[PDB]
Amino acid sequence: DYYLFLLRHSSLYDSFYYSNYVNAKLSLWNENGKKRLHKMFARMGIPLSTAQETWLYMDHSIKRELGIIFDKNLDRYGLQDIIRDGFVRTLGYRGSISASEFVEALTALLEVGNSAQKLTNLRKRWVSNFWLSWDALDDRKVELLNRGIQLAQDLQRAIFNTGVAILEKKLIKHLRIYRLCVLQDGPDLDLYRNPLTLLRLGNWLIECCAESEDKQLLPMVLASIDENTDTYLVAGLTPRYPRGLDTIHTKKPILNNFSMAFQQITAETDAKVRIDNFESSIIEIRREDLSPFLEKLTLSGL
Amino acid sequence: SVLAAANPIYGRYDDLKSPGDNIDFQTTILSRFDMIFIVKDDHNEERDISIANHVINIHTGNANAMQNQQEENGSEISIEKMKRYITYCRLKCAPRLSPQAAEKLSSNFVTIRKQLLINELESTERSSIPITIRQLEAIIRITESLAKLELSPIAQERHVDEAIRLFQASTMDAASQDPIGGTSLSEIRRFEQELKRRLPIGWSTSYQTLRREFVDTHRFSQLALDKALYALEKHETIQLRHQGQNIYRS
């Protein structure tokens, strides 16, 4: 199996286009990325009309030969780290599924489904979505998995659409210690009220930042806005090494000090924050209180 | 069913010009139609502010989210579900009237016919928008559609009131829309002279006294009432308060 977004349920072209690893490796958010992708497809020899068909109806001979095609072509672009070994579950004549696809469907179903009062309503719809995902586990239901798969497609599309805008506008400010970016205004901001969706976006962003010529591993701070509450949701993200790296430089995983920094600043100053997430690296802050708080975080020992 | 979008001559409606030479359609063609809506353009800057807001929002960067919420809160339904609903309602139900509704429709029709006659005898030209029995059939069919909307196998006063309201909107906007088109004016200037002299600014007088005086004189009731209500329509020197009894000179 390969690091591909819903390979067995979307066309191979869209799979390569939305796969985060290929995105990071070849910069598909501008034109040269698409040109290199088309060159790769041509050198493989799959037609652009063929590669844009569903995996079921796509040609059987090249379905069989896909492994050899990848082995012989991917070396030039250096994407050979996309091939791995995984698990596949088959139930009679129903079809085939894989662990990565199933967990992505579950994650998307958790994300999307169906002042204090609004916060309580959000926290209760989160539990409702959790129970819906739980019920989706059993093998007697598949209409709660097809919906999850299509919603995963939609969510990944929206995340890509927002990330291309971020990297185009160059909102990533490089401070002395830690990078910072704030989504002041844009599209589809209402989706990012979910911490897991925000983490997915941040994971893609940190992958993109890592897959560059920069040799600095800096923590990242990301913020959002919901005009209904007039609050900023802030999450701290750790740097990540390139996936294709040896294990010798893996003595200790990169730690996360953001929870300690947040608790120390909240203890020493009377900010209007609300630290109640089980993930201690995610806090809520006020719009007027954000900027001085950030200053403090800059001036504090990390 | 026929749905038509048309523009008047000279572009804008040009209210200053008479309605008769603002619409080129003959009497026969308009009679077949039964809802005619005069969509005038207005400038008050608050509707303009709201419309600019709505347009900039409906710009594709924003509305693509907001309209989605109308399918998530249950406020509005999708187009194809509406299509299925309308075809199902067309096939299933066909309501009927009730005698009380018949009496109300008869009285309303008599009233509008009398009003048309009273406008025509004043303006002394034929109305550019006619009122005939086809309009009575129109109100009946509007009521039938209103009842059909809820699948009720009978139509009652609840639908009749809405139908009459819609018909009155669509007839007062067009037919009775200033039927005079703007003794002649000589009595008008004589009338305005005397009340200005006799009645100063700040006080008020009874309507009955004014009517009595100016019917005793040559002005009479038909000329005075129109003159009084147009001086009101001038809306810069005379105001009405406390029902139609008090004539306040601001």
Side-chain angles (χ1 to χ4, degrees), chain A residues 1-63 65-139 141-175 177-210 212 217-250 253-271 273 275-278 280-286 289-295 297-302, chain B residues 1-66 68-218 220-233 237-250:
Chain A
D1 54 342
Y2 320 101
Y3 293 64
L4 289 185
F5 182 83
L6 288 181
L7 181 56
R8 293 170 173 80
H9 292 256
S10 62
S11 78
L12 177 55
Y13 179 66
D14 308 309
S15 178
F16 280 164
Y17 181 59
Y18 282 121
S19 65
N20 301 352
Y21 184 45
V22 169
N23 172 295
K25 272 299 308 177
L26 287 186
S27 293
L28 281 73
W29 45 277
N30 61 359
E31 203 72 19
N32 301 123
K34 305 178 48 51
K35 298 295 185 290
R36 277 176 297 265
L37 173 64
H38 278 92
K39 176 168 151 312
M40 178 172 140
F41 265 113
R43 199 179 200 283
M44 269 185 303
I46 312 181
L48 270 296
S49 70
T50 300
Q52 289 195 350
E53 284 214 354
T54 316
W55 178 265
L56 294 172
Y57 311 108
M58 196 217 77
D59 171 59
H60 174 74
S61 307
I62 59 172
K63 274 169 69 170
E65 295 180 354
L66 198 61
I68 307 173
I69 282 176
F70 281 171
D71 191 6
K72 70 180 285 215
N73 277 92
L74 285 169
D75 201 1
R76 175 171 289 178
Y77 309 87
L79 286 179
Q80 85 274 18
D81 296 317
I82 201 170
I83 296 171
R84 70 174 189 174
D85 288 327
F87 309 101
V88 179
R89 184 172 166 265
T90 315
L91 185 52
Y93 306 153
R94 290 44 170 163
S96 293
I97 202 60
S98 85
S100 307
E101 305 156 52
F102 190 77
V103 295
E104 301 320 297
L106 279 176
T107 301
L109 190 62
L110 269 179
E111 305 313 291
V112 186
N114 211 0
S115 169
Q117 56 275 20
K118 299 95 171 183
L119 193 62
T120 305
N121 286 8
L122 267 288
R123 290 174 181 203
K124 75 180 180 67
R125 66 93 171 175
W126 283 333
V127 181
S128 296
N129 292 319
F130 165 83
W131 265 123
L132 192 151
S133 158
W134 166 281
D135 288 331
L137 275 167
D138 56 352
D139 285 342
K141 319 295 298 312
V142 286
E143 60 269 17
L144 290 175
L145 198 65
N146 308 339
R147 193 157 151 227
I149 281 177
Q150 73 183 359
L151 289 177
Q153 287 159 348
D154 293 347
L155 290 183
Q156 187 70 9
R157 184 192 318 288
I159 291 313
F160 184 89
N161 181 25
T162 297
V164 69
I166 290 295
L167 278 160
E168 178 70 29
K169 276 144 163 277
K170 307 272 186 172
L171 304 191
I172 296 176
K173 281 280 176 280
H174 178 287
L175 308 173
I177 302 301
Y178 70 103
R179 294 176 184 109
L180 160 67
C181 79
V182 181
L183 272 69
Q184 185 35 258
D185 171 36
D188 70 13
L189 274 179
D190 51 300
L191 280 72
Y192 300 73
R193 287 157 326 184
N194 195 287
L196 294 174
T197 295
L198 188 64
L199 269 293
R200 156 181 276 180
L201 173 64
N203 281 321
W204 178 37
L205 266 293
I206 183 61
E207 182 65 81
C208 168
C209 286
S212 76
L217 312 162
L218 311 185
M220 184 176 177
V221 171
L222 164 60
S224 164
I225 175 61
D226 47 348
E227 51 85 18
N228 303 294
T229 308
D230 198 0
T231 44
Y232 289 161
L233 200 152
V234 176
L237 305 177
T238 54
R240 274 202 314 263
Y241 283 113
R243 300 193 193 195
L245 271 192
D246 47 36
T247 59
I248 178 60
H249 191 183
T250 307
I254 298 169
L255 315 181
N256 192 4
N257 313 121
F258 275 123
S259 54
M260 301 174 27
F262 288 159
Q263 71 184 359
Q264 191 170 2
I265 300 309
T266 309
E268 77 162 67
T269 55
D270 47 0
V273 302
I275 314 172
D276 45 358
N277 203 31
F278 293 140
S280 51
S281 80
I282 295 189
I283 61 183
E284 295 187 33
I285 204 164
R286 298 291 295 178
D289 293 329
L290 173 80
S291 169
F293 178 83
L294 296 186
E295 176 63 29
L297 182 47
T298 307
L299 60 85
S300 52
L302 195 61
Chain B
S1 304
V2 190
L3 185 60
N7 305 73
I9 320 168
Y10 323 125
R12 205 262 187 185
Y13 179 67
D14 204 350
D15 191 300
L16 180 61
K17 186 62 66 68
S18 176
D21 49 355
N22 264 318
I23 299 169
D24 47 356
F25 296 109
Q26 289 280 344
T27 303
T28 65
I29 175 62
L30 278 185
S31 304
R32 275 138 187 73
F33 277 95
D34 59 359
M35 291 181 182
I36 52 174
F37 288 94
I38 295 184
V39 190
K40 293 189 183 71
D41 211 6
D42 279 313
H43 310 82
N44 50 10
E45 192 272 341
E46 74 263 11
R47 199 160 205 148
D48 299 283
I49 280 297
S50 310
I51 283 172
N53 295 320
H54 187 93
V55 167
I56 299 163
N57 284 18
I58 212 73
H59 179 62
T60 191
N62 195 2
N64 64 327
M66 331 285 278
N68 175 58
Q69 290 313 305
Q70 275 180 350
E71 288 188 356
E72 293 181 11
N73 288 273
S75 61
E76 289 186 19
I77 68 181
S78 52
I79 186 168
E80 81 297 327
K81 204 168 191 172
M82 158 82 98
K83 184 191 304 179
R84 297 230 289 288
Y85 184 75
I86 171 174
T87 192
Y88 170 60
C89 293
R90 266 197 162 265
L91 295 183
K92 183 60 67 179
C93 186
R96 199 185 181 222
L97 290 192
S98 56
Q100 308 91 13
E103 291 280 352
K104 188 184 284 185
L105 265 294
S106 164
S107 303
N108 189 233
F109 179 72
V110 168
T111 289
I112 51 167
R113 193 85 152 184
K114 188 177 274 200
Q115 196 262 2
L116 176 68
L117 181 136
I118 209 68
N119 275 339
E120 179 171 298
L121 66 93
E122 179 270 335
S123 81
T124 191
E125 72 274 16
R126 293 292 186 182
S127 164
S128 186
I129 294 165
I131 297 296
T132 52
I133 295 92
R134 269 188 157 102
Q135 269 61 33
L136 188 139
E137 321 311 295
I139 315 160
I140 287 179
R141 278 177 268 103
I142 293 152
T143 299
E144 284 303 335
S145 165
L146 266 167
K148 203 177 189 177
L149 178 51
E150 60 176 83
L151 306 174
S152 166
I154 193 166
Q156 280 270 28
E157 319 315 297
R158 287 184 314 114
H159 318 123
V160 164
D161 273 358
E162 178 75 68
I164 288 178
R165 186 193 73 82
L166 268 166
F167 185 64
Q168 277 184 353
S170 46
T171 189
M172 189 66 204
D173 217 357
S176 196
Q177 187 256 329
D178 280 329
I180 75 164
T183 185
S184 191
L185 271 297
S186 81
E187 278 281 323
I188 303 302
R189 297 282 75 77
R190 148 195 180 277
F191 200 89
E192 207 277 331
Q193 177 65 257
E194 266 313 309
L195 60 90
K196 174 197 311 175
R197 159 184 284 116
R198 190 180 286 153
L199 195 151
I201 289 170
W203 284 264
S204 180
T205 189
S206 172
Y207 183 82
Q208 163 178 225
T209 300
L210 177 146
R211 197 273 319 144
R212 173 177 59 240
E213 202 279 333
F214 285 108
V215 161
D216 285 337
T217 61
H218 208 169
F220 282 60
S221 57
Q222 298 209 334
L223 302 179
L225 175 52
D226 195 8
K227 173 50 191 312
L229 69 90
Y230 280 165
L232 295 169
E233 191 274 331
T237 175
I238 286 169
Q239 178 185 1
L240 292 175
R241 286 206 209 90
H242 305 158
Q243 321 289 0
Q245 287 281 358
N246 211 41
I247 319 297
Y248 179 84
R249 188 178 170 96
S250 177

